[PDB]
Design a protein around this ligand. Structure first.
Ligand SMILES: O=c1ccn([C@@H]2O[C@H](COP(=O)(O)OP(=O)(O)O)[C@@H](O)[C@H]2O)c(=O)[nH]1
Length: 505
C-alpha cells in the first residue's frame, strides 16, 4: 500500500550502484513480479551477477541484455537458491555454472573429505534448529555449573523454538544432582539423553564409558564428549555445538536449513604459512575444529561417521603412533609405556603423577636425560654427568647440580627447588593436551578425514568473487559449518589467516 515496494526499489538501486548507463527504473519495473529482498543481496558488488552486469553495461543493447540475464538468473538460480538456504558463495558458483557465456571459470576440482568426493549439487541438507550439547560432570553433587546452565537458558530463551538435546551421564551424578538435572531439562524443554543406557553397535561406546569410569585415573570427560560426536545413534541430524557457544541472531536463516557438499560439516579456517622451499612460496593449510559440527539428514552421514569411528578406535588401541611427534614422545616415561603396552589412561595418569610428585628425582626418571636437558637448559657435559651419577643422588644432590650448572634461570634451597619445579610445570600443558587432542580430539578427526596433505596446497589468491576452484575454496564454500550456521567460534583461525598474525588465545 506500500512502504515495502519502496524498500525493495531502494535496495535494488543501491545494489546496482545507482548506475545510469541503463535505466534502473525500467529494469526494476520489468523484474519486480519476481523480485524479493532476499534476492537482491546476490546482485551487489562482490557477486558474480554484479560482475557480469558490469561487463554487460559496456555492451551494445545493455538494457535488454541485462534484463534478460537477470530475469533468468533470478528465476532459475538465485531465487530457488535463497529458498533452499544457499550461501552467497554457493549462489555465485551456481550463476557461474548457468552462464558460462558470461563468466569464465574452471571446473570443480576433485577433493576428498572423509572418504567422500565433495559435491556442488547442494544435496546435503542440515537443520540449524536442532542442537545437541554434552555435559559430563566431574562433581557428583553438581549436575552443571551455573555458567553452562545460563548458556543453555540463553540459547533457548533467545532463540526458540530450536530443539535442544543434552547428553549427560546419570552415573556421574549423585541422586540429588540427578533429580536437579531432570528438572532443569524439563523446565527448559531440553531433551535429555543418558549415555549410560544408550543402544548402539559403535566401537566408540566402550571407550566413552571407560573415559568416564576412569575419572581420577587418567580418564578425561572432554575426551568422552569428543567421542560421543561420532556415534550415529546420538547424532544423525542438526548440530553439535559446544555448550558454551553463542548464537549470532542475524545469522539465523528463515527456512532453518543450510546445505553442504558433504554430509558431515565442521568448523574450518586456514593458515597461510611462512614462505617455504624451494620456490619461496606460501602454502595454505586448512584447519578444522569440532566445536561446531553439522550432520545431514541422509544415509551418507552414517557412512562418513563410520569411517571416522574406525580411525578413533584405532588410535585408542595404539596411541603411540598418534602421539609420535608430540612433546611427551621425547620423554623416558613414554618410551617405557610404549614397550609395556600401557593404555591412554595410564599414559595420562602417569603424566599427572609425575608433576604432582614435587620431586626433582622423580621428574628426572620421568623426563629422561634428553628432555631433562632441554627443560633446564643444561650443557651436554652437565647432563652427561648427572645421568652417569643419578643412581647415587638424593634429592638435594640433584638440586645442587642444577644451581652450579645454570642460574641465571632462577641462595635458599627451599625457594630454589620451587623455582626449578615451576620451570618444569610450564611444560605440563604441552605434554597433556595432545593425549586428548590427538586421540579423540580435533587432531584425530583431522587425520581421520584426510590429514595434513589432503588439506595443504600452495596458496593462490583471487581474482574477484570467490569460487570453489581449488581445494581449500571447495572446502570453504561447501563443507564449513561455522560460517553457514548460526553459532560463533573464535576457537580456531578464520579462513586465510597469516601464520604470523594468529589472534588466538
Ligand atoms: O567437565 C567437563 C568438561 C568439558 N566437557 C565436554 O568437553 C567440552 C570441553 O571443551 P571446552 O568447552 O572446554 O573448550 P572451550 O569452550 O573452552 O573452547 C565441553 O563442550 C563438554 O562437552 C564435559 O563434558 N565436562
Amino acid at each position: 500500500r506500500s512502504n515495502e515496494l519502496s524498500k525493495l526499489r531502494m535496495r535494488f538501486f543501491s545494489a546496482l550502484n545507482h548506475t545510469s548507463e541503463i535505466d534502473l527504473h525500467t529494469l526494476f519495473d520489468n523484474l519486480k513480479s519476481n523480485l524479493t529482498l532476499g534476492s537482491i543481496e546476490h546482485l551487489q558488488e562482490g557477486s558474480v551477477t554484479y560482475a557480469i552486469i558490469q561487463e554487460l553495461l559496456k555492451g551494445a543493447d545493455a538494457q535488454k541484455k541485462i534484463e534478460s540475464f537477470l530475469k533468468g538468473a533470478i528465476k532459475n538460480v538465485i531465487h530457488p537458491g535463497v529458498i533452499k538456504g544457499l550461501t552467497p558463495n554457493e549462489i555465485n558458483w551456481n550463476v557461474a555454472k548457468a552462464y558460462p557465456e558470461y563468466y569464465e571459470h574452471e571446473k570443480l576440482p576433485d577433493v576428498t573429505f572423509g572418504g567422500f568426493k565433495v559435491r556442488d549439487s547442494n544435496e546435503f541438507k542440515f537443520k540449524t534448529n536442532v542442537q545437541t550439547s554434552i555435559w559430563f560432570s566431574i562433581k557428583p553433587e553438581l549436575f552443571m555449573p551455573s555458567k553452562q546452565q545460563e548458556a543453555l537458558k540463553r540459547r533457548r530463551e533467545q532463540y526458540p523454538g530450536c530443539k535442544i538435546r543434552l547428553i549427560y551421564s546419570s552415573s556421574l551424578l549423585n541422586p540429588e544432582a540427578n533429580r536437579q538435572m531432570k528438572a532443569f531439562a524439563k523446565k527448559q524443554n531440553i531433551s535429555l539423553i543418558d549415555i549410560d543406557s544408550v543402544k548402539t553397535d559403535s566401537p566408540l561406546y566402550p571407550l566413552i564409558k571407560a573415559e568416564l569410569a576412569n575419572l581420577g585415573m587418567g580418564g578425561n570427560p572432554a575426551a568422552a564428549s569428543d567421542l560421543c560426536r561420532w556415534i550415529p545413534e546420538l547424532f544423525n541430524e542438526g548440530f553439535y555445538v559446544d555448550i558454551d557457544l553463542p548464537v549470532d541472531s542475524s545469522k539465523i536463516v528463515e527456512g532453518h536449513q543450510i546445505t553442504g557438499g558433504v554430509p558431515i560439516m565442521l568448523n574450518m579456517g586456514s593458515i597461510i604459512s611462512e614462505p617455504i622451499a624451494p620456490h619461496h612460496r606460501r602454502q595454505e593449510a586448512v584447519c578444522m575444529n569440532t566445536d561446531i559440527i553439522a550432520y545431514a539428514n541422509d544415509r551418507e552421514t552414517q557412512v562418513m561417521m563410520d569411517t571416522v569411528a574406525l580411525h578413533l578406535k584405532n588410535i585408542y588401541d595404539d596411541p603411540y603412533t598418534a602421539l609420535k611427534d608430540t612433546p611427551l614422545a621425547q620423554t623416558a616415561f613414554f618410551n617405557r609405556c610404549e614397550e609395556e603396552g600401557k593404555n591412554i589412561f595410564e599414559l595420562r595418569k602417569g603424566l599427572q603423577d609425575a608433576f604432582r610428585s614435587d620431586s626433582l628425582l622423580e621428574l628426572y626418571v620421568f623426563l629422561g636425560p634428553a628432555k631433562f636437558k632441554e627443560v633446564f637448559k643444561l650443557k651436554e657435559t652437565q647432563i652427561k654427568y648427572i645421568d652417569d651419577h643419578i643412581s647415587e643422588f638424593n634429592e638435594h644432590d640433584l638440586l645442587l647440580h642444577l644451581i652450579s650448572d645454570n642460574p641465571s634461570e632462577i641462595l635458599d634451597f627451599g625457594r630454589a627447588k620451587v623455582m626449578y619445579m615451576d620451570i618444569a610445570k610450564e611444560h605440563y600443558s604441552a605434554f597433556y593436551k595432545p593425549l586428548v587432542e590427538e586421540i579423540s580430539g580435533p587432531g584425530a578427526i583431522y587425520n581421520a578425514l584426510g590429514g595434513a596433505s589432503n588439506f595443504t596446497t600452495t596458496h593462490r589468491r583471487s581474482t574477484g568473487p570467490m569460487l570453489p576452484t581449488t581445494p581449500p575454496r571447495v572446502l570453504q564454500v561447501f563443507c564449513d559449518a561455522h560460517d553457514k550456521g548460526p553459532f560463533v567460534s573464535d576457537n580456531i583461525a578464520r579462513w586465510q589467516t597469516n601464520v604470523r598474525e594468529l589472534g588466538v588465545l
